[PDB]
Structures are given as C-alpha cells and as structure tokens.
Design a protein around this nucleic acid. Structure first.
Length: 184
RNA sequence: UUCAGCGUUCUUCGGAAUGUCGCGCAUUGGCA
C-alpha cells in the first residue's frame, strides 16, 4: 500500500479535492482509525449501527475515537554540534541526516506496531512527528510499550545525549472537524 | 630759461599627485 500512497501523492498533489491527495490520505487515516476503534468495540454491523437512526452519525462525532499523538526528539542541535573540528564538515552533514532518518524509522516502527500506514502520520517536523491514531486500548498499550522501548534504547545507546518523548490526547470526530474551535 | 623726476604694475595662469599591489604562506580547516 505504501507504494500506492507514494503514487497517489505525486499524481494528486496539485489537483483540487486542500488538494485531492491530502484529502484522500486524511480519509484513509481516519478510516483506519475508525476501523480499529470498531474492532475494539466489536460492532455487529458497522453500517447499521452508524447510519440506521441517522442521528448516530452525529453521535459518533461525539464519541472519543481518535488520538492526536506527538513524538519529539530532544537533543538535535547539541547532537549535530557536539563535534570536534577534525571531521566537522563531514560530521555536521551526517548527524542531521542521521537524526531525520532515525525519526522516520521511529514512526515506521510505531506504524508497524499499529498495522497502520504513513497516511496516519499527519506530518514530520525535523525532530518532531505528529500522527493520528485509533483510541483503542490495544493502540494505547502499544504507544506505552513503544515509549518505554524508545526510552530504554536511547538510554542504552546515547544515554542523556538524545531522548524521545511521546504524548497523546483523546479527541472526537467534531474535534477533527474544528467544531467549537477546540482542534487548535 | 632753469629745477625735478613722477605715476603704474610687485608676480600671473595651469598642473595639486597618479598608477601598481591592498597581505601571503605554514600549522588549523578541507580532501582522503
């Protein structure tokens, strides 16, 4: 699917739906999160439970179903500039690339732990990563375990030179729909 | 016919610096 997502983005980047890719990706992520939430709740019929009363569509935008997740890497500039000059030119280019590549790996690992795709990562800042995840208990436990494992690995490799902090917040469909201005 | 000099200019006009370099090399860095 990753190849399909990469293809979709190049083709739909400069065409209106927010471009079409942006919308398609966001839809995919939201869908995956909803599917995981419904699997956690074990609904008998997704369509009937959602569209039957025709008010359940509105109420489902009020159930806490999504998680806004931010993972941030601490120690970027110090790591790039904790160098002696002997190989500075080389080191400075390599350290910045290594830190960005490591951040990519992180989220990929996290996605591999959630069986999700890159559509669920809204964007990656240098040293930063914002994602949208399902609010399932399994996903929450996966996030906790991933935070613990990342803490252990960073302490085992760089000690206090680099760290990673992961924080999540629960939200509903209306929050994603910028109702009442709560999203920002 | 004799007696006398007297007055006016006291320097003038141009050119007033120019061109050339305006730090270099070694260590260091960089490449390997």
């Amino acid at each position: 699917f990753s190849s399909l997502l990469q293809w979709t983005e190049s083709l739909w980047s400069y065409i209106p739906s927010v471009s079409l890719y942006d919308h398609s990706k966001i839809t995919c992520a939201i869908a995956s999160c909803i599917y995981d939430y419904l699997t956690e709740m074990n609904c008998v019929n997704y369509r009937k439970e959602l569209f039957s009363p025709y008010e359940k569509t509105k109420q489902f935008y009020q159930e806490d179903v999504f998680l806004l997740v931010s993972l941030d890497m601490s120690g970027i500039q110090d790591f790039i500039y904790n160098i002696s000059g002997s190989k500075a030119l080389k080191s400075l280019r390599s350290r910045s690339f290594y830190l960005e590549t490591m951040l990519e790996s992180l989220v990929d690992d996290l996605l591999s732990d959630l069986e999700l795709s890159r559509a669920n990562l809204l964007y990656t800042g240098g040293g930063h990563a914002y994602l949208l995840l399902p609010n399932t208990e399994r996903a929450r436990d996966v996030l906790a375990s991933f935070e613990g494992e990342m803490k252990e690995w960073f302490i085992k490799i760089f000690k206090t030179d680099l760290s990673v902090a992961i924080a999540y917040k629960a939200c509903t469909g209306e929050d994603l729909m910028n109702s009442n201005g709560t999203y920002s």
